Design a protein around this ligand. Structure first.
Ligand SMILES: C[C@@H]1O[C@H](NC(=O)c2cccc(-c3ccccc3)c2)[C@@H](O)[C@H](O)[C@@H]1O
Ligand SMILES: C[C@@H]1O[C@H](NC(=O)c2cccc(-c3ccccc3)c2)[C@@H](O)[C@H](O)[C@@H]1O
Ligand SMILES: C[C@@H]1O[C@H](NC(=O)c2cccc(-c3ccccc3)c2)[C@@H](O)[C@H](O)[C@@H]1O
Lengths: 130, 130, 131
């Protein structure tokens, strides 16, 4: 039992709080998963951030109970000569029998960065047992 | 059933088109997979690129039908002081019942870059159902 | 369909010329009753950084009781980075349990004397299957 959602682009976003990346959503309930474990992979292979103060993006895996895992990339220069593509992957294993109905990908600005996904990205899950 | 192929190095390559990374090939047919879903992970943990115009590498997951997912890393300087190692992971979920016999890893130059893998890299797949 | 996972929210700062264990990134394959088959292992360190004076970086490894099965690194592209940016890292290996594997662990080693930092979420995961 394999869940997968993929996008080829997202709207540009700037946010001080975690907001949902449109299209990176897995309905666990719709697949009739009510117990057990999901290994979740948020894969954003070609993201970039724009800004004037060491830009970056915070990414999270979230369920109906909140954020379960988060991370980020940041550039190593204040004003990068060019905002290079910086691959990002996040892996978390969640318990469904806690009352999980959904899994989603979120993002949040680092230091006011504008966040960009303009190519393929994916949210995936494999089901198993404790 | 768990598919896996790993390499410890590849030849240096420059290409304006996607070409196959030698050794990163999964034979779905030989494994007797003709239906269902594969979650594929292309993992190139220690790549780098060389060039004079903001180097990088494009990576793709491809089947007998073509590319199903792609991404890249790029540096953030035109002529990096040193071409740092830039980890890359791509994840895609494919339908084997569409006529898939193989899954392979490909790469393509960014702006004429020379592409380097000189350490471990892997192409993996887990089979499941919808 | 057993799913193994270990996660941390931080580790101690480390400088090491040799691979050392990242505390908390450990999977007991035996205790889970796995004695045969294949594990697909993912080491995920999404927000690491390194500090140093000479193009800093970190080497990461997946290891078993038999030794290292896979390794990689990130490195910065400047000798003395203006700031040590967070550089996401993932390593994927598929191992055989029936060779005498009891455990899987995450390791790290300095690049050029770097100090190694994990101060946020990181994970070691495994999915069991067969050839
Ligand atoms: C923000 C810039 O984005 C550039 N990339 C593009 O503008 C671009 C244009 C067309 C296609 C793609 C692309 C294609 C396949 C997969 C991902 C991206 C990138 C990239 O090369 C630079 O280093 C920099 O990060
Ligand atoms: C291109 C350069 O490559 C260097 N890497 C090596 O020269 C090197 C030499 C021996 C072994 C390895 C290695 C070992 C394990 C896994 C990956 C690479 C790297 C690296 O330190 C620099 O920052 C830079 O990106
Ligand atoms: C070493 C620096 O680390 C900074 N990050 C932090 O200091 C920081 C502070 C509080 C929280 C977090 C964090 C939160 C969620 C996930 C990961 C990290 C980072 C980062 O923005 C910079 O670019 C740089 O790499």
């Amino acid at each position: 039992p394999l869940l997968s959602a993929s996008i080829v682009s997202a709207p540009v976003v700037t946010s001080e709080t975690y907001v949902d990346i449109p299209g990176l959503y897995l309905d666990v309930a719709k697949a009739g998963i009510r117990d057990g474990k999901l290994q979740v992979i948020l894969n954003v292979p070609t993201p970039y951030a724009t800004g004037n103060n060491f830009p970056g993006i915070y990414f999270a895996i979230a369920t109906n109970q909140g954020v379960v895992a988060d991370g980020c990339f940041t550039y190593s220069s204040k004003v990068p000569e060019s905002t290079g593509r910086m691959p990002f992957t996040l892996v978390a294993t969640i318990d469904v029998g806690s009352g999980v109905t959904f899994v989603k990908g979120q993002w949040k600005s680092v230091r006011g960065s504008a966040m960009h996904i303009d190519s393929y990205a994916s949210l995936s899950a494999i089901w198993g047992t404790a």
